[PDB]
Amino acid sequence: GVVHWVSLVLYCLAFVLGIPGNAIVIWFTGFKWKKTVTTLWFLNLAIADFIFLLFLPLYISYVAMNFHWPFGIWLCKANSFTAQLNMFASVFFLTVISLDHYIHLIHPVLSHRHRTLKNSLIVIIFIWLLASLIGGPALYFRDTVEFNNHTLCYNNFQKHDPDLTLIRHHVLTWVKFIIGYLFPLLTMSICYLCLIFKVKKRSILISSRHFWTILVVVVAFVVCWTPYHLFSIWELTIHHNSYSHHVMQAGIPLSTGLAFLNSCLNPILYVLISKKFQARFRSSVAEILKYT
């Protein structure tokens, strides 16, 4: 029963140092710095992670009180819509960051005529709309029912249909898996590996400084996001058979904590570790602290 406490401390540590990390980037990359194409992806990613972490209190309170949801009915739908809207936006922006890095750093001719501050707006709007589009079913299927003196808030499918359980459950789970894990992981891995392997073919040497910044980002992404999708896939067996249900109640919280931890890690591995940020932050904080 220790796993519940581990999950709780994981949510707590994601909470405490997650919101300030996103807020610093949001304040200092969109207000003071001059807008560029490469500084908009990071600002939007920070916004998505900030909003994702801000609405965490409700979920951690729900998990804390032995899975009880006293916050009515509508707030489930709002919480679930917020959940699978910032997550998908953050993941898609993680994909576009790798795309832009590969195209701009090794294909200059394609750049200089496509990397425009006005072209980034179209991609931003498209991503922010598609993320909400996938998050729509969360707004619709969520419902609570009371049981064991507690009210469980869950994805409800029993809405009076004969082709109910298997078809829509498999469709939703597989769509979420395919559009959340396989496509972004494959895209980022392909882009980074191709960039690394094409740099060597021209005899220029990449710096060991950012080679680690490319390797650790991918490894963190995979470790953080694989268990939640694996547990979503492996939650689809209780329809087929009467199953354990104790591995689920322990497994899913743990990977939920890991996925929440990734949203606070992204502010750290992408920005806040680069020499550019360190220089431009010290040179400004020294002057700001001087002012009183």
């Binding site: 979920y59 998990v63 969360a138 969520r142 869950y154 994805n155 459950h169 199953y243 109640q249 939920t256």
Partner: peptide, 9 residues
């Protein structure tokens, strides 16, 4: 088992 019981979903 209700789907989504312990996740944010």
């Amino acid at each position: 088992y209700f789907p989504g019981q312990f996740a944010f979903s």
